[PDB]
Amino acid sequence: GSSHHHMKQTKASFEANKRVYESVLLTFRGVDGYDVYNCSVPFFYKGKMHIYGRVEKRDIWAASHVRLFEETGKDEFTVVPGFYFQLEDPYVAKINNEMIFGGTHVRKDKQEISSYYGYFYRGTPDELTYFTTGPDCMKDIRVLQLQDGRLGVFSRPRVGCRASIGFVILNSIDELGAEVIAKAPPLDILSENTWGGVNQAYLLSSGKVGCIGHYSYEDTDEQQQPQRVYVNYSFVLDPQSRAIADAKIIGTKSCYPPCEPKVPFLADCVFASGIVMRSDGRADLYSGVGDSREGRITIDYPFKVHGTIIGDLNFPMA
Ligand code: NA
């Protein structure tokens, strides 16, 4: 698809000191011959765990779609007939008891990518209605509902080697559009020669925002081959002061079971999906692995000092 054609020391510390309690790859049924990866966070609908997956052949020129899957066994998901989107990298949020769903839409002219943008949909998994679009050539836009009911919006401008995560508060999802996302001011998250993005935002009991995302940079492996490193990253935003706290690596490719990446320069790449709280007080971190599989690791809850999650991703029928 679109992506395929100091943190280095922080990562080496993480690789030495990591606490991983469980480690699996997900099995997907019903889409044989496609890879499934870079999913949404899992959510609940009709009493069942579901996830949206990015569905794409291994070939770097193959185009992505998104399908809905339902949990049919432990770490086993079966495609739900009847729901397709022409998108990459799907993601979900709950705003006023409604699903907001998004993905990256790729526009082509004479078999080459001409533009891409975030498409946003609202409703429930049985019927999602496309309603707004992000700015030209931006991805990694994410929303959540804040403690006062307003809409937090994360942007992610990226032009060559200049990238930032931005953030703006809107009154409601009815204001979400290209110009307000484009004008979101920067947050102090990404360093020079790095990139990254929010994948899933959570409202915490303190009123702060717990972010699960990715942090990325260029490196060279032991065999002196190029790698675009992607790590699972967390931080906590204070939406009033805009201060960033407790920024840290929470997962890396070595945490998940071994698997072939889509291309050789994604051998140390994981693209976060989100966390699900467990019966044992730990977090299940779901992630894309090598732009080819979806994995799950059990980790310490990454927002302990800033509070527990407010609300859930259990979606009511319309
Ligand atoms: Na991407």
PDB file of C-alpha atoms and ligand atoms in Angstrom:
ATOM      1  CA  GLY A   1       0.000   0.000   0.000  1.00  0.00           C
ATOM      2  CA  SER A   2       0.823   3.763   0.422  1.00  0.00           C
ATOM      3  CA  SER A   3       3.774   3.155   2.889  1.00  0.00           C
ATOM      4  CA  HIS A   4       5.630   0.404   0.874  1.00  0.00           C
ATOM      5  CA  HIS A   5       7.042   2.112  -2.342  1.00  0.00           C
ATOM      6  CA  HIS A   6      18.012   9.092  21.273  1.00  0.00           C
ATOM      7  CA  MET A   7      14.970   6.767  20.740  1.00  0.00           C
ATOM      8  CA  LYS A   8      17.479   4.104  19.483  1.00  0.00           C
ATOM      9  CA  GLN A   9      19.016   4.027  23.050  1.00  0.00           C
ATOM     10  CA  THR A  10      15.546   4.121  24.706  1.00  0.00           C
ATOM     11  CA  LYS A  11      14.624   1.086  22.536  1.00  0.00           C
ATOM     12  CA  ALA A  12      17.826  -0.822  23.481  1.00  0.00           C
ATOM     13  CA  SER A  13      16.950  -0.240  27.198  1.00  0.00           C
ATOM     14  CA  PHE A  14      13.376  -1.453  26.542  1.00  0.00           C
ATOM     15  CA  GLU A  15      14.656  -4.616  24.732  1.00  0.00           C
ATOM     16  CA  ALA A  16      16.762  -5.463  27.871  1.00  0.00           C
ATOM     17  CA  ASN A  17      14.126  -4.635  30.568  1.00  0.00           C
ATOM     18  CA  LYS A  18      10.740  -5.456  28.797  1.00  0.00           C
ATOM     19  CA  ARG A  19       7.943  -7.132  30.866  1.00  0.00           C
ATOM     20  CA  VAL A  20       5.741  -9.260  28.531  1.00  0.00           C
ATOM     21  CA  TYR A  21       3.390 -11.716  30.241  1.00  0.00           C
ATOM     22  CA  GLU A  22       1.692 -13.242  27.143  1.00  0.00           C
ATOM     23  CA  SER A  23       2.598 -13.146  23.408  1.00  0.00           C
ATOM     24  CA  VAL A  24       0.473 -14.411  20.435  1.00  0.00           C
ATOM     25  CA  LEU A  25      -0.347 -13.792  16.765  1.00  0.00           C
ATOM     26  CA  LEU A  26      -4.037 -13.611  15.793  1.00  0.00           C
ATOM     27  CA  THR A  27      -5.543 -16.179  13.386  1.00  0.00           C
ATOM     28  CA  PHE A  28      -7.970 -14.706  10.746  1.00  0.00           C
ATOM     29  CA  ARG A  29     -10.475 -17.002   8.926  1.00  0.00           C
ATOM     30  CA  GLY A  30     -12.395 -16.255   5.738  1.00  0.00           C
ATOM     31  CA  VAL A  31      -9.903 -14.031   3.784  1.00  0.00           C
ATOM     32  CA  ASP A  32      -7.391 -16.676   2.596  1.00  0.00           C
ATOM     33  CA  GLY A  33      -4.681 -15.250   0.302  1.00  0.00           C
ATOM     34  CA  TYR A  34      -4.718 -11.819   2.010  1.00  0.00           C
ATOM     35  CA  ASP A  35      -2.548 -10.690   4.921  1.00  0.00           C
ATOM     36  CA  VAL A  36      -4.536  -9.071   7.812  1.00  0.00           C
ATOM     37  CA  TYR A  37      -2.733  -6.428   9.902  1.00  0.00           C
ATOM     38  CA  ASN A  38      -2.754  -2.904  11.426  1.00  0.00           C
ATOM     39  CA  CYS A  39      -6.255  -3.543  12.873  1.00  0.00           C
ATOM     40  CA  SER A  40      -8.505  -1.231  14.853  1.00  0.00           C
ATOM     41  CA  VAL A  41      -8.496  -1.723  18.632  1.00  0.00           C
ATOM     42  CA  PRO A  42     -10.864  -4.613  19.459  1.00  0.00           C
ATOM     43  CA  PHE A  43     -14.377  -3.554  20.534  1.00  0.00           C
ATOM     44  CA  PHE A  44     -17.647  -5.206  21.533  1.00  0.00           C
ATOM     45  CA  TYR A  45     -20.860  -5.350  19.512  1.00  0.00           C
ATOM     46  CA  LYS A  46     -23.911  -7.663  19.972  1.00  0.00           C
ATOM     47  CA  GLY A  47     -22.130  -9.087  23.077  1.00  0.00           C
ATOM     48  CA  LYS A  48     -19.102 -10.321  20.993  1.00  0.00           C
ATOM     49  CA  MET A  49     -15.524  -9.045  20.540  1.00  0.00           C
ATOM     50  CA  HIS A  50     -14.982  -7.667  17.027  1.00  0.00           C
ATOM     51  CA  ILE A  51     -12.100  -6.011  15.216  1.00  0.00           C
ATOM     52  CA  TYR A  52     -11.620  -4.197  11.876  1.00  0.00           C
ATOM     53  CA  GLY A  53      -8.625  -5.473   9.880  1.00  0.00           C
ATOM     54  CA  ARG A  54      -6.578  -4.092   7.041  1.00  0.00           C
ATOM     55  CA  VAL A  55      -6.809  -6.821   4.361  1.00  0.00           C
ATOM     56  CA  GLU A  56      -4.161  -6.776   1.618  1.00  0.00           C
ATOM     57  CA  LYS A  57      -2.150  -9.199  -0.507  1.00  0.00           C
ATOM     58  CA  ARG A  58       1.600  -9.513   0.331  1.00  0.00           C
ATOM     59  CA  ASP A  59       2.561  -7.881  -3.068  1.00  0.00           C
ATOM     60  CA  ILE A  60       3.723  -4.199  -2.344  1.00  0.00           C
ATOM     61  CA  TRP A  61       1.529  -2.898  -5.265  1.00  0.00           C
ATOM     62  CA  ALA A  62      -1.613  -4.650  -3.907  1.00  0.00           C
ATOM     63  CA  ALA A  63      -4.335  -2.283  -2.557  1.00  0.00           C
ATOM     64  CA  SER A  64      -5.935  -2.583   0.914  1.00  0.00           C
ATOM     65  CA  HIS A  65      -9.505  -2.989   1.988  1.00  0.00           C
ATOM     66  CA  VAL A  66     -11.007  -3.193   5.476  1.00  0.00           C
ATOM     67  CA  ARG A  67     -13.275  -5.984   6.713  1.00  0.00           C
ATOM     68  CA  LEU A  68     -15.085  -6.565  10.057  1.00  0.00           C
ATOM     69  CA  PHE A  69     -14.139  -9.744  12.006  1.00  0.00           C
ATOM     70  CA  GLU A  70     -15.800 -11.362  15.027  1.00  0.00           C
ATOM     71  CA  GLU A  71     -13.946 -13.403  17.675  1.00  0.00           C
ATOM     72  CA  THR A  72     -14.754 -17.109  17.074  1.00  0.00           C
ATOM     73  CA  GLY A  73     -12.087 -18.585  19.460  1.00  0.00           C
ATOM     74  CA  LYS A  74      -9.169 -17.498  21.620  1.00  0.00           C
ATOM     75  CA  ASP A  75      -7.159 -15.037  19.404  1.00  0.00           C
ATOM     76  CA  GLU A  76      -9.195 -16.338  16.426  1.00  0.00           C
ATOM     77  CA  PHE A  77     -11.275 -14.001  14.241  1.00  0.00           C
ATOM     78  CA  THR A  78     -13.692 -14.877  11.406  1.00  0.00           C
ATOM     79  CA  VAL A  79     -14.692 -12.406   8.724  1.00  0.00           C
ATOM     80  CA  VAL A  80     -18.237 -11.017   9.033  1.00  0.00           C
ATOM     81  CA  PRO A  81     -19.904 -11.149   5.585  1.00  0.00           C
ATOM     82  CA  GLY A  82     -21.351  -7.954   4.192  1.00  0.00           C
ATOM     83  CA  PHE A  83     -19.077  -4.990   5.130  1.00  0.00           C
ATOM     84  CA  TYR A  84     -16.121  -3.724   3.037  1.00  0.00           C
ATOM     85  CA  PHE A  85     -14.275  -0.390   2.842  1.00  0.00           C
ATOM     86  CA  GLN A  86     -11.627   0.721   0.279  1.00  0.00           C
ATOM     87  CA  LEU A  87      -9.239   1.924   3.066  1.00  0.00           C
ATOM     88  CA  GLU A  88      -5.921   1.287   4.879  1.00  0.00           C
ATOM     89  CA  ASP A  89      -5.299   1.220   8.673  1.00  0.00           C
ATOM     90  CA  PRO A  90      -8.803   1.248  10.180  1.00  0.00           C
ATOM     91  CA  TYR A  91      -9.574   2.730  13.619  1.00  0.00           C
ATOM     92  CA  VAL A  92     -12.593   3.263  15.914  1.00  0.00           C
ATOM     93  CA  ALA A  93     -13.745   5.543  18.720  1.00  0.00           C
ATOM     94  CA  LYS A  94     -16.945   5.972  20.769  1.00  0.00           C
ATOM     95  CA  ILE A  95     -18.472   9.505  20.675  1.00  0.00           C
ATOM     96  CA  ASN A  96     -21.947  10.066  22.285  1.00  0.00           C
ATOM     97  CA  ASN A  97     -22.824   6.288  22.186  1.00  0.00           C
ATOM     98  CA  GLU A  98     -22.005   6.138  18.417  1.00  0.00           C
ATOM     99  CA  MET A  99     -19.055   4.529  16.581  1.00  0.00           C
ATOM    100  CA  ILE A 100     -16.744   6.908  14.700  1.00  0.00           C
ATOM    101  CA  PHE A 101     -14.771   4.732  12.224  1.00  0.00           C
ATOM    102  CA  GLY A 102     -11.962   5.884   9.981  1.00  0.00           C
ATOM    103  CA  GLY A 103      -9.290   4.775   7.567  1.00  0.00           C
ATOM    104  CA  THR A 104      -6.916   6.130   4.922  1.00  0.00           C
ATOM    105  CA  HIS A 105      -8.451   6.497   1.455  1.00  0.00           C
ATOM    106  CA  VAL A 106      -5.942   6.344  -1.436  1.00  0.00           C
ATOM    107  CA  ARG A 107      -6.660   8.187  -4.707  1.00  0.00           C
ATOM    108  CA  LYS A 108      -4.919   6.974  -7.916  1.00  0.00           C
ATOM    109  CA  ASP A 109      -4.243   8.462 -11.343  1.00  0.00           C
ATOM    110  CA  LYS A 110      -2.778   6.185 -14.092  1.00  0.00           C
ATOM    111  CA  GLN A 111      -2.052   3.413 -11.554  1.00  0.00           C
ATOM    112  CA  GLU A 112      -0.005   5.761  -9.164  1.00  0.00           C
ATOM    113  CA  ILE A 113      -1.043   7.332  -5.811  1.00  0.00           C
ATOM    114  CA  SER A 114      -2.081  11.015  -6.413  1.00  0.00           C
ATOM    115  CA  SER A 115      -3.461  11.870  -2.887  1.00  0.00           C
ATOM    116  CA  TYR A 116      -4.589  10.113   0.323  1.00  0.00           C
ATOM    117  CA  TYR A 117      -6.742  11.343   3.199  1.00  0.00           C
ATOM    118  CA  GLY A 118      -8.619  10.215   6.298  1.00  0.00           C
ATOM    119  CA  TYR A 119     -12.250   9.162   5.661  1.00  0.00           C
ATOM    120  CA  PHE A 120     -14.536   9.268   8.735  1.00  0.00           C
ATOM    121  CA  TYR A 121     -17.799   7.319   9.137  1.00  0.00           C
ATOM    122  CA  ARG A 122     -20.457   7.377  11.925  1.00  0.00           C
ATOM    123  CA  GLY A 123     -23.111   4.936  13.126  1.00  0.00           C
ATOM    124  CA  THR A 124     -22.757   1.320  14.311  1.00  0.00           C
ATOM    125  CA  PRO A 125     -20.909  -1.652  12.742  1.00  0.00           C
ATOM    126  CA  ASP A 126     -24.226  -2.684  11.032  1.00  0.00           C
ATOM    127  CA  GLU A 127     -24.367   0.701   9.199  1.00  0.00           C
ATOM    128  CA  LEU A 128     -21.502   3.244   9.037  1.00  0.00           C
ATOM    129  CA  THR A 129     -22.123   6.482   7.084  1.00  0.00           C
ATOM    130  CA  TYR A 130     -19.209   8.406   5.520  1.00  0.00           C
ATOM    131  CA  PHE A 131     -19.464  12.049   6.647  1.00  0.00           C
ATOM    132  CA  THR A 132     -16.123  13.952   6.539  1.00  0.00           C
ATOM    133  CA  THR A 133     -12.547  13.920   5.280  1.00  0.00           C
ATOM    134  CA  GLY A 134      -9.154  15.006   6.634  1.00  0.00           C
ATOM    135  CA  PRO A 135      -6.710  17.273   4.817  1.00  0.00           C
ATOM    136  CA  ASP A 136      -4.802  16.234   1.654  1.00  0.00           C
ATOM    137  CA  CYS A 137      -1.944  13.767   2.287  1.00  0.00           C
ATOM    138  CA  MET A 138      -2.440  13.332   6.090  1.00  0.00           C
ATOM    139  CA  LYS A 139      -3.053  10.097   7.939  1.00  0.00           C
ATOM    140  CA  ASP A 140      -2.972   9.091  11.638  1.00  0.00           C
ATOM    141  CA  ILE A 141      -5.902  11.400  12.624  1.00  0.00           C
ATOM    142  CA  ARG A 142      -7.660  10.185  15.828  1.00  0.00           C
ATOM    143  CA  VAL A 143     -10.493  11.382  18.057  1.00  0.00           C
ATOM    144  CA  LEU A 144     -11.938  10.839  21.520  1.00  0.00           C
ATOM    145  CA  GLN A 145     -14.554  12.371  23.802  1.00  0.00           C
ATOM    146  CA  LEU A 146     -13.079  14.475  26.671  1.00  0.00           C
ATOM    147  CA  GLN A 147     -14.304  14.724  30.280  1.00  0.00           C
ATOM    148  CA  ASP A 148     -16.517  17.793  29.389  1.00  0.00           C
ATOM    149  CA  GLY A 149     -18.079  16.030  26.341  1.00  0.00           C
ATOM    150  CA  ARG A 150     -16.031  17.990  23.717  1.00  0.00           C
ATOM    151  CA  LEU A 151     -14.012  16.246  20.942  1.00  0.00           C
ATOM    152  CA  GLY A 152     -10.234  15.872  21.185  1.00  0.00           C
ATOM    153  CA  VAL A 153      -8.624  15.600  17.730  1.00  0.00           C
ATOM    154  CA  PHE A 154      -5.083  14.395  17.042  1.00  0.00           C
ATOM    155  CA  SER A 155      -3.520  15.442  13.735  1.00  0.00           C
ATOM    156  CA  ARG A 156      -0.296  14.169  12.167  1.00  0.00           C
ATOM    157  CA  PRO A 157       1.328  16.407   9.523  1.00  0.00           C
ATOM    158  CA  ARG A 158       4.188  14.601   7.750  1.00  0.00           C
ATOM    159  CA  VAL A 159       6.101  16.059   4.750  1.00  0.00           C
ATOM    160  CA  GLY A 160       9.419  14.284   4.024  1.00  0.00           C
ATOM    161  CA  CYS A 161      11.438  14.098   7.250  1.00  0.00           C
ATOM    162  CA  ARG A 162       9.315  16.778   9.078  1.00  0.00           C
ATOM    163  CA  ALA A 163       6.526  15.219  11.173  1.00  0.00           C
ATOM    164  CA  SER A 164       4.513  16.282  14.230  1.00  0.00           C
ATOM    165  CA  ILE A 165       1.502  15.145  16.285  1.00  0.00           C
ATOM    166  CA  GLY A 166      -0.982  18.021  16.731  1.00  0.00           C
ATOM    167  CA  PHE A 167      -4.074  18.375  18.887  1.00  0.00           C
ATOM    168  CA  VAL A 168      -7.167  20.592  18.926  1.00  0.00           C
ATOM    169  CA  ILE A 169     -10.440  20.544  20.909  1.00  0.00           C
ATOM    170  CA  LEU A 170     -13.676  20.884  18.850  1.00  0.00           C
ATOM    171  CA  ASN A 171     -17.203  21.253  20.243  1.00  0.00           C
ATOM    172  CA  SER A 172     -18.422  18.139  18.374  1.00  0.00           C
ATOM    173  CA  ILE A 173     -17.879  15.638  15.573  1.00  0.00           C
ATOM    174  CA  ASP A 174     -20.097  17.933  13.348  1.00  0.00           C
ATOM    175  CA  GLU A 175     -17.113  20.417  13.224  1.00  0.00           C
ATOM    176  CA  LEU A 176     -14.579  17.753  12.117  1.00  0.00           C
ATOM    177  CA  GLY A 177     -13.165  18.645   8.690  1.00  0.00           C
ATOM    178  CA  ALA A 178      -9.927  19.178   6.729  1.00  0.00           C
ATOM    179  CA  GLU A 179      -9.302  22.873   7.679  1.00  0.00           C
ATOM    180  CA  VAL A 180      -9.667  22.440  11.519  1.00  0.00           C
ATOM    181  CA  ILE A 181      -7.452  19.276  11.464  1.00  0.00           C
ATOM    182  CA  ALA A 182      -4.857  21.072   9.256  1.00  0.00           C
ATOM    183  CA  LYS A 183      -4.749  24.030  11.731  1.00  0.00           C
ATOM    184  CA  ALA A 184      -4.365  21.875  14.909  1.00  0.00           C
ATOM    185  CA  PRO A 185      -1.335  23.231  16.840  1.00  0.00           C
ATOM    186  CA  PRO A 186       1.642  20.864  17.479  1.00  0.00           C
ATOM    187  CA  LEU A 187       2.256  18.892  20.660  1.00  0.00           C
ATOM    188  CA  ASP A 188       5.833  18.410  21.919  1.00  0.00           C
ATOM    189  CA  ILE A 189       6.068  14.626  21.173  1.00  0.00           C
ATOM    190  CA  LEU A 190       8.218  13.821  18.063  1.00  0.00           C
ATOM    191  CA  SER A 191      11.949  14.700  17.864  1.00  0.00           C
ATOM    192  CA  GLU A 192      13.941  15.753  14.821  1.00  0.00           C
ATOM    193  CA  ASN A 193      14.438  12.846  12.297  1.00  0.00           C
ATOM    194  CA  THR A 194      11.559  10.898  13.865  1.00  0.00           C
ATOM    195  CA  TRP A 195       7.933  10.294  12.997  1.00  0.00           C
ATOM    196  CA  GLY A 196       4.979   8.636  14.732  1.00  0.00           C
ATOM    197  CA  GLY A 197       1.285   9.009  15.465  1.00  0.00           C
ATOM    198  CA  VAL A 198      -1.579   8.338  17.889  1.00  0.00           C
ATOM    199  CA  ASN A 199      -3.355   5.006  17.125  1.00  0.00           C
ATOM    200  CA  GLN A 200      -5.891   4.972  20.033  1.00  0.00           C
ATOM    201  CA  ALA A 201      -6.771   7.673  22.594  1.00  0.00           C
ATOM    202  CA  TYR A 202      -8.457   7.021  25.959  1.00  0.00           C
ATOM    203  CA  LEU A 203     -10.052   9.359  28.525  1.00  0.00           C
ATOM    204  CA  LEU A 204      -8.506   8.786  31.976  1.00  0.00           C
ATOM    205  CA  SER A 205     -10.125   9.251  35.420  1.00  0.00           C
ATOM    206  CA  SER A 206      -7.821  12.347  35.963  1.00  0.00           C
ATOM    207  CA  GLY A 207      -9.369  14.005  32.842  1.00  0.00           C
ATOM    208  CA  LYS A 208      -6.039  13.471  31.016  1.00  0.00           C
ATOM    209  CA  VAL A 209      -5.765  11.580  27.687  1.00  0.00           C
ATOM    210  CA  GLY A 210      -3.855   8.305  27.515  1.00  0.00           C
ATOM    211  CA  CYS A 211      -2.436   7.719  24.039  1.00  0.00           C
ATOM    212  CA  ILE A 212      -1.336   4.385  22.512  1.00  0.00           C
ATOM    213  CA  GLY A 213       0.639   5.048  19.340  1.00  0.00           C
ATOM    214  CA  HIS A 214       3.765   4.497  17.274  1.00  0.00           C
ATOM    215  CA  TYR A 215       7.216   6.129  17.295  1.00  0.00           C
ATOM    216  CA  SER A 216       9.411   5.615  14.249  1.00  0.00           C
ATOM    217  CA  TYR A 217      12.924   6.384  12.931  1.00  0.00           C
ATOM    218  CA  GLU A 218      15.506   5.103  10.405  1.00  0.00           C
ATOM    219  CA  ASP A 219      18.181   2.699  11.619  1.00  0.00           C
ATOM    220  CA  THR A 220      20.594   0.021  10.274  1.00  0.00           C
ATOM    221  CA  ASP A 221      20.393  -3.648  11.508  1.00  0.00           C
ATOM    222  CA  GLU A 222      23.439  -5.918  12.410  1.00  0.00           C
ATOM    223  CA  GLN A 223      23.751  -6.857   8.646  1.00  0.00           C
ATOM    224  CA  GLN A 224      23.926  -3.062   7.822  1.00  0.00           C
ATOM    225  CA  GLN A 225      20.515  -3.210   6.020  1.00  0.00           C
ATOM    226  CA  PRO A 226      18.073  -0.229   6.237  1.00  0.00           C
ATOM    227  CA  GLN A 227      15.182  -0.526   8.776  1.00  0.00           C
ATOM    228  CA  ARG A 228      12.234   1.798   9.355  1.00  0.00           C
ATOM    229  CA  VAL A 229      11.849   1.032  13.086  1.00  0.00           C
ATOM    230  CA  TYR A 230       8.325   1.325  14.534  1.00  0.00           C
ATOM    231  CA  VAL A 231       7.759   0.768  18.273  1.00  0.00           C
ATOM    232  CA  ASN A 232       4.587   0.669  20.353  1.00  0.00           C
ATOM    233  CA  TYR A 233       4.565   3.977  22.282  1.00  0.00           C
ATOM    234  CA  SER A 234       2.447   5.485  25.087  1.00  0.00           C
ATOM    235  CA  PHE A 235       2.194   8.955  26.607  1.00  0.00           C
ATOM    236  CA  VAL A 236      -0.342  11.013  28.597  1.00  0.00           C
ATOM    237  CA  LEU A 237      -1.610  14.415  27.389  1.00  0.00           C
ATOM    238  CA  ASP A 238      -3.062  17.099  29.701  1.00  0.00           C
ATOM    239  CA  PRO A 239      -5.572  18.609  27.211  1.00  0.00           C
ATOM    240  CA  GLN A 240      -5.579  22.035  29.032  1.00  0.00           C
ATOM    241  CA  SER A 241      -1.782  22.663  29.596  1.00  0.00           C
ATOM    242  CA  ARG A 242      -0.884  20.404  26.580  1.00  0.00           C
ATOM    243  CA  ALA A 243       1.970  18.949  28.703  1.00  0.00           C
ATOM    244  CA  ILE A 244       3.147  15.449  27.697  1.00  0.00           C
ATOM    245  CA  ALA A 245       3.983  13.027  30.548  1.00  0.00           C
ATOM    246  CA  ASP A 246       5.129   9.413  31.014  1.00  0.00           C
ATOM    247  CA  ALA A 247       6.222   8.981  27.329  1.00  0.00           C
ATOM    248  CA  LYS A 248       7.635   5.458  26.956  1.00  0.00           C
ATOM    249  CA  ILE A 249       8.048   2.374  24.741  1.00  0.00           C
ATOM    250  CA  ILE A 250       5.520  -0.362  25.666  1.00  0.00           C
ATOM    251  CA  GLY A 251       6.204  -2.921  22.878  1.00  0.00           C
ATOM    252  CA  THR A 252       8.524  -3.874  20.002  1.00  0.00           C
ATOM    253  CA  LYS A 253       8.557  -6.521  17.245  1.00  0.00           C
ATOM    254  CA  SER A 254      10.669  -8.870  19.506  1.00  0.00           C
ATOM    255  CA  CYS A 255       7.739  -8.946  22.020  1.00  0.00           C
ATOM    256  CA  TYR A 256       5.416 -10.689  19.463  1.00  0.00           C
ATOM    257  CA  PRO A 257       5.916 -14.200  18.064  1.00  0.00           C
ATOM    258  CA  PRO A 258       8.258 -14.395  15.056  1.00  0.00           C
ATOM    259  CA  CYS A 259       6.848 -13.579  11.621  1.00  0.00           C
ATOM    260  CA  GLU A 260       8.095 -12.464   8.143  1.00  0.00           C
ATOM    261  CA  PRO A 261       7.603  -8.687   7.558  1.00  0.00           C
ATOM    262  CA  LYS A 262       5.905  -7.489   4.342  1.00  0.00           C
ATOM    263  CA  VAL A 263       9.250  -5.972   3.149  1.00  0.00           C
ATOM    264  CA  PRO A 264      12.777  -6.427   4.530  1.00  0.00           C
ATOM    265  CA  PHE A 265      13.032  -2.859   5.983  1.00  0.00           C
ATOM    266  CA  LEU A 266      10.007  -3.535   8.330  1.00  0.00           C
ATOM    267  CA  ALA A 267      11.840  -6.308  10.315  1.00  0.00           C
ATOM    268  CA  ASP A 268      11.620  -4.157  13.523  1.00  0.00           C
ATOM    269  CA  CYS A 269       8.158  -2.607  12.837  1.00  0.00           C
ATOM    270  CA  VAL A 270       5.017  -2.860  15.002  1.00  0.00           C
ATOM    271  CA  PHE A 271       2.047  -0.494  14.356  1.00  0.00           C
ATOM    272  CA  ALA A 272      -0.141  -0.190  17.532  1.00  0.00           C
ATOM    273  CA  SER A 273      -3.902  -0.987  17.394  1.00  0.00           C
ATOM    274  CA  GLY A 274      -4.870  -0.300  21.023  1.00  0.00           C
ATOM    275  CA  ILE A 275      -5.219  -1.767  24.546  1.00  0.00           C
ATOM    276  CA  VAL A 276      -8.017  -3.813  26.104  1.00  0.00           C
ATOM    277  CA  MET A 277      -8.183  -4.101  29.908  1.00  0.00           C
ATOM    278  CA  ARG A 278      -8.066  -7.665  31.285  1.00  0.00           C
ATOM    279  CA  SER A 279      -9.724  -9.558  34.152  1.00  0.00           C
ATOM    280  CA  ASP A 280      -6.226  -9.604  35.846  1.00  0.00           C
ATOM    281  CA  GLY A 281      -5.655  -5.796  35.876  1.00  0.00           C
ATOM    282  CA  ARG A 282      -3.113  -5.937  32.981  1.00  0.00           C
ATOM    283  CA  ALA A 283      -3.536  -4.631  29.400  1.00  0.00           C
ATOM    284  CA  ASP A 284      -3.776  -6.647  26.178  1.00  0.00           C
ATOM    285  CA  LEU A 285      -1.860  -4.551  23.584  1.00  0.00           C
ATOM    286  CA  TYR A 286      -3.033  -5.393  20.035  1.00  0.00           C
ATOM    287  CA  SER A 287      -0.641  -4.347  17.231  1.00  0.00           C
ATOM    288  CA  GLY A 288       0.168  -4.731  13.591  1.00  0.00           C
ATOM    289  CA  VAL A 289       3.409  -6.781  13.251  1.00  0.00           C
ATOM    290  CA  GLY A 290       5.697  -6.192  10.215  1.00  0.00           C
ATOM    291  CA  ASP A 291       2.776  -4.852   8.077  1.00  0.00           C
ATOM    292  CA  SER A 292       1.794  -8.569   7.673  1.00  0.00           C
ATOM    293  CA  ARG A 293       0.126  -9.943  10.890  1.00  0.00           C
ATOM    294  CA  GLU A 294      -1.784  -8.797  13.984  1.00  0.00           C
ATOM    295  CA  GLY A 295      -0.447  -9.711  17.443  1.00  0.00           C
ATOM    296  CA  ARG A 296      -1.385  -9.407  21.097  1.00  0.00           C
ATOM    297  CA  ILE A 297       0.959  -8.968  24.096  1.00  0.00           C
ATOM    298  CA  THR A 298       0.009  -8.701  27.753  1.00  0.00           C
ATOM    299  CA  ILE A 299       1.756  -5.709  29.435  1.00  0.00           C
ATOM    300  CA  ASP A 300       1.444  -3.553  32.561  1.00  0.00           C
ATOM    301  CA  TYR A 301      -1.403  -0.986  32.232  1.00  0.00           C
ATOM    302  CA  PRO A 302       0.596   1.917  30.709  1.00  0.00           C
ATOM    303  CA  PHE A 303      -1.319   4.860  32.365  1.00  0.00           C
ATOM    304  CA  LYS A 304      -1.152   3.777  36.066  1.00  0.00           C
ATOM    305  CA  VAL A 305      -0.003   7.122  37.535  1.00  0.00           C
ATOM    306  CA  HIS A 306      -2.601   9.144  35.493  1.00  0.00           C
ATOM    307  CA  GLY A 307      -5.717   7.011  36.246  1.00  0.00           C
ATOM    308  CA  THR A 308      -7.954   4.203  34.946  1.00  0.00           C
ATOM    309  CA  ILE A 309      -9.858   4.364  31.621  1.00  0.00           C
ATOM    310  CA  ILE A 310     -13.259   6.108  31.620  1.00  0.00           C
ATOM    311  CA  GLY A 311     -15.939   4.551  29.374  1.00  0.00           C
ATOM    312  CA  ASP A 312     -15.647   1.551  27.080  1.00  0.00           C
ATOM    313  CA  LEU A 313     -15.730   0.343  23.445  1.00  0.00           C
ATOM    314  CA  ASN A 314     -18.966  -1.638  23.848  1.00  0.00           C
ATOM    315  CA  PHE A 315     -21.234  -0.349  21.066  1.00  0.00           C
ATOM    316  CA  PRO A 316     -25.019  -0.425  21.460  1.00  0.00           C
ATOM    317  CA  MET A 317     -27.448  -1.390  18.615  1.00  0.00           C
ATOM    318  CA  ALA A 318     -29.125   1.614  16.817  1.00  0.00           C
TER     319      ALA A 318
HETATM  320 NA    NA B   1       0.287   4.389   7.891  1.00  0.00          NA
END
